[PDB]
């Protein structure tokens, strides 16, 4: 089983290649990490195993879900440190995913009910609805297209959040540039209708993610920085006319950032020759594949060299010992979609049984 051959992910030595994918669970009440999160990640932590936390707010305007953790206040760093210690006390490596939803927000999630910010003024179409704090579903509003000065301010929010994560004890961070959120709103030409230096050509549309990665790399180091993208996922109207060309353009800038920094990024994380094999071959460094992978598909991806690590999402919600179950080829538990985003600290969160 190649999933349990060790792997060197920069400075971190992993004992297996099963990774916990980032998953918003909405148990961080009032954007403050709770003790339930520490129990949740501890259940899933393994000695030498890699964990990626739920998307974490970088600023008061970055949230589009209820009760998602932040890492932009000192109270948030204080609470995150207790969760990181418990995870580290089981021998695991943990990255904090920095997450800005962009236009994928709503009045109720914004300070003073302000409009969400984005690369464009176009809202997410009527086909998608946002989850509201009371469990209902609302309408995505018109975002406010930000200028270039505000862009550099959002980049500074990524930078300050990356330092706060290291302050909390995180081994590193992952840049959330997937699933049609703020960074994807600049990447995809189905959303980015700008005419300034951040829109139009592939180079202009890759400029925002390039500045975000360079800023956090300069702050904490490249080997503590992971990047996640999803060129071929159309979530929230995040379509590109050429997802392969866009994905290869992003890899080219990531490869260049590593050359200009003298170090490799922690990894490239792609969720969805296959599109995934093409980006892996083009990227000079560690590759994590994500999306619909099983035990056999993950074994095969590592054996054929398609990826170095495999992240599992939904199966990790219902199987806290998913790493052990994959090792023993033990039957897995079903997950309950109803409690994906509820607020109970136990029900549908930490009460999924171990083997
Ligand atoms: C409830 C839920 C929350 C998720 N939250 C995030 C997130 O915050 N950031 C992210 O990049 N992906 C998020 N994802 C996507 C997963 O990380 C993963 O890419 C996707 O679930 C496919 O993995 P799987 O088929 O193994 O479940 C989430 C998925 C689910 C089901």
Ordered by where they begin, the domains of the chain are 2-339 (3.20.20.70)
Q: Give me ligand 1 centre to Cα 21, in Å.
A: 6
Cβ of 176 closer than 6 Å to ligand 1, yes or no, is yes
Query: What angle do the packed helices 148-167 and 207-220 form, to 10 degrees?
Result: 30
Burial class from Cβ neighbours inside 10 Å (0-12, 13-18, 19+) for residue 53 reads: buried
| Interatomic CA distance for residues 115 and 286, integer angstroms | 38
Find tokens 């270039």 and name the residue.
148
> Please, where are the H alpha helices in 89-201?
148-167, 182-187
Find tokens 């939803």 and name the residue.
101
Tell which atom from ligand 1 comes closest to the C-alpha of 179.
11
Active site residue 7: no
Distances (CA, A) of 121 to 118, 125, 143, 242: 7, 12, 5, 22
User: What does the block give as tokens for 26?
Assistant: 């909405």
Q: 180: alpha, beta or left, given left = phi > 0 and alpha = psi -120 to 50?
A: left
Resolution in A: 2.0
CA-wise closest residue to 61 among 31, 25, 26:
31
Calculate the dihedral angle through the C-alpha atoms of 106, 317, 347, 90, rounding to the nearest 10 degrees: -110
| Interatomic CA distance for residues 117 and 164, integer angstroms | 23
Please choose from 3, 17, 19, 22 the residue to mutate so as to test ligand 1's pocket, defined by most ligand atoms within 8 A of CB. Answer: 22
Distances (CA, A) of 30 to 64, 68, 161, 202, 314: 13, 8, 18, 38, 24
Q: Give me ligand 1 centre to Cα 228, in Å.
A: 11
The residues near 153 (Cβ < 8 Å, ≥ 6 apart) are: none
Q: How was this entry determined? A: X-ray
| Interatomic CA distance for residues 52 and 71, integer angstroms | 15
Residue 143 CB neighbours (<10 A): 23
Tell which atom from ligand 1 comes closest to the C-alpha of 97.
9
The residues near 267 (Cβ < 8 Å, ≥ 6 apart) are: 9, 226, 227, 285, 286, 287, 288, 308, 309
| Interatomic CA distance for residues 43 and 171, integer angstroms | 19
Give the pairing of strands 18-20 and 12-14.
unpaired
CA-wise closest residue to 228 among 279, 290, 178:
178
Under 8 Å between Cβ of 11 and 223 = yes
| Interatomic CA distance for residues 99 and 154, integer angstroms | 11
Catalytic residue among 181, 293, 312, 352: 181
Cβ of 271 closer than 6 Å to ligand 1, yes or no, is yes
Distances (CA, A) of 127 to 53, 130, 140, 216: 28, 10, 10, 34
Across the strands, what pairs with 155?
Answer: none
CA-wise closest residue to 134 among 342, 348, 353, 344:
342
Cβ of 228 closer than 6 Å to ligand 1, yes or no, is yes
């Amino acid at each position: 089983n190649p999933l349990f051959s060790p792997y060197k992910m920069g400075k971190f030595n992993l004992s297996h290649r099963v990774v916990l994918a980032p998953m918003t669970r909405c148990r961080a009440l009032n954007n403050i990490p709770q003790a339930a999160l520490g129990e949740y990640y501890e259940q899933r932590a393994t000695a030498g195993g890699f964990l990626i936390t739920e998307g974490t707010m970088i600023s008061p305007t970055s949230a589009g879900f209820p009760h998602v953790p932040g890492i932009f206040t000192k109270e948030q760093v204080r609470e995150w440190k207790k969760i990181v210690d418990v995870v580290h006390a089981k021998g695991a490596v943990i990255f904090c995913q920095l997450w800005h939803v962009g236009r994928a927000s709503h009045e109720v999630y914004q300070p003073a009910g302000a409009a969400p910010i984005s690369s464009t003024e176009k809202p997410i179409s009527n086909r998608w609805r946002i989850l509201m704090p009371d469990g209902t579903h609302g309408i995505y509003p018109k975002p406010r297209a930000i200028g270039t000065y505000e862009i550099s301010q959002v980049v500074e929010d990524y930078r300050r959040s990356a330092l706060n994560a290291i302050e909390a004890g995180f081994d590193g961070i992952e840049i959330h540039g997937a699933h049609g959120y703020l960074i994807d709103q600049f990447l995809k030409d189905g959303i980015n209708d700008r005419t300034d230096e951040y829109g139009g050509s592939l180079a202009n549309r890759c400029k925002f993610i390039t500045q975000v990665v360079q800023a956090v790399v300069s702050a904490i180091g490249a080997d503590r920085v992971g990047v996640r993208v999803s060129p071929a996922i159309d979530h929230l109207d995040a379509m590109d006319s050429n997802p392969l060309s866009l994905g290869l353009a992003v890899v080219e800038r990531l490869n260049k950032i590593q050359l200009h920094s003298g170090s490799k990024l922690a990894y490239l994380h792609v969720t969805a020759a296959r599109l995934m094999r093409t980006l892996r071959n083009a990227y000079q460094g560690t590759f994590i594949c994500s999306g619909g992978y099983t035990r056999e598909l993950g074994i095969e991806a590592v054996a054929q060299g398609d990826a170095d690590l495999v992240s599992y999402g939904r199966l990790f919600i219902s199987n806290p010992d998913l790493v052990m179950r994959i090792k023993l080829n033990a039957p897995l538990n079903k997950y309950n979609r109803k409690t994906f985003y509820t607020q109970d600290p136990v029900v549908g969160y930490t009460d999924y049984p171990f083997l």
